[PDB]
Amino acid sequence: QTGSAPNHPSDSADSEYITSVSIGTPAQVLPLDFDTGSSDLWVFSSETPKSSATGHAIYTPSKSSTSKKVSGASWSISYGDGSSSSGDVYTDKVTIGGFSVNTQGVESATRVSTEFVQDTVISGLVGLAFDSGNQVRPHPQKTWFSNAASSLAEPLFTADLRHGQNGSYNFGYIDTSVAKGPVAYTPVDNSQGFWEFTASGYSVGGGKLNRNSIDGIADTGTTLLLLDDNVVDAYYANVQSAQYDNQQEGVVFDCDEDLPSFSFGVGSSTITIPGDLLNLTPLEEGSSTCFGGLQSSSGIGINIFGDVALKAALVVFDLGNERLGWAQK
Amino acid sequence: XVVXAX
């Protein structure tokens, strides 16, 4: 049994990726952000303040014959970019890409921060990190994928994200036909609740991998590739027009730069992010200055292989084996 | 950017 759900970038700068999820009976279809960097499935709902939810699709549990409120359950989450949300908890049927989890924790937001209010195209998150991170109290809720995993053909899911084009989130099988190399695996450390792994080294512009390893997390819910200041410095060292822009809070450079690739080692295999994908966006319409897809992790204190990196590959989140696979795309 | 549960 499998699931396959088309995803799409929310805007022209691939800020985040959106995928439909059907909750309840009959199905209420919500566009949600699948986030392998958090552990809670939360939605804008009929309990979200109308002033916060206006313009967003919402889940209304009273119109679902399979919903049930979880007495005494509450939750609150603060995200890496300063955004937040909090609420109470229902269970209901949740179907993604045609595969259903019958009794899934669906966290209803009774408060969300301005960032989520303004992002009208999403209606919440599906947390796909480890169950240990789930924020429901007193009793944590399992993630949709953890609940689905024992009933799928295999307990794995894949992310295929693309620049400016629809991609897919698949469950229960590995569609390598979207990739041009084989899946290479490395072990995951779930001690902090994340898909944390170590890349064995990196290279800028295509020479041999160095052995300067990088510990970081595979996060479909982060836009950028966020790496330490030494790596950022190495990446931009020969990008002539590169400079830190205090207003953008990031490195920028002329849009016509021919950017070098960024490669990193998954065990002894290489994944290469082409320079194309390291140019995120012009600073505004018609601008000659562009914002880099690789930026410093020094602000958040943890390296994050976000969508900029994930776009270079078919990425296998293998919960059965607690490993992370990357096939060059 | 967005950065999702620090």
| CB of A129 closer than 8 Å to CB of A143 | yes
CA angle, residues A9, A11, A16, in degrees to nearest 5: 45
Residue showing tokens 């562009």:
A290
Does the fold of domain A175-329 match that of domain A5-174?
yes
**Structural domain boundaries of chain A?**
5-174, 175-329
| CB of B2 closer than 8 Å to CB of A13 | no
Query: Cβ A135–B5 below 8 Å, yes or no?
Result: yes
Q: What is the spatial distance between Cα A253 and Cα A258, in angstroms, rounded to a whole number?
A: 10
Rg over CA atoms, chain B: 6
Helical spans, DSSP H, in A144-290: 144-149, 229-236
Residue showing tokens 């490669």:
A263
DSSP string, A108-145: EEEEE-HHHHH-TT--EEEE-S-GGG---BSS----HH
Overall resolution, Å: 1.9
Q: What is the spatial distance between Cα A170 and Cα A2, in angstroms, rounded to a whole number?
A: 7
Q: What is the spatial distance between Cα A37 and Cα A268, in angstroms, rounded to a whole number?
A: 25
> In the PDB record, what is the listed experimental method?
X-ray
Residue A219, min C-alpha distance to chain B (Å): 8
Residue showing tokens 């027009």:
A241
Residue showing tokens 């390598």:
A176
Q: What is the spatial distance between Cα A6 and Cα A98, in angstroms, rounded to a whole number?
A: 11
CATH for A175-329? 2.40.70.10
Nearest to A59 by CA among A86, A35, A93: A93
Q: Residue A238 half-sphere exposure, CB side, CA atoms within 13 Å?
A: 8
CA angle, residues A154, A41, A162, in degrees to nearest 5: 65
What count of other Cβ atoms lies within 10 Å of the Cβ of residue A142? 17
Query: Cβ B4–A77 below 8 Å, yes or no?
Result: no
CA angle, residues A165, A167, A170, in degrees to nearest 5: 175
User: Count of CB contacts below 8 A, A vs B?
Assistant: 52
**CB contact burial A204-222 (16+ within 10 A = b; e otherwise):** beeeebeebebebbbbbbb
**CATH 3.30.420.40 describes domain A5-174:** no
| CB of A203 closer than 8 Å to CB of A212 | no
What count of other Cβ atoms lies within 10 Å of the Cβ of residue A269? 19
Q: What is the spatial distance between Cα A277 and Cα A275, in angstroms, rounded to a whole number?
A: 5
Residue B6, min C-alpha distance to chain A (Å): 5
Q: What is the spatial distance between Cα A45 and Cα A113, in angstroms, rounded to a whole number?
A: 14
Chain B CB contacts of A135 under 8 Å are 5
CA angle, residues A316, A317, A323, in degrees to nearest 5: 100
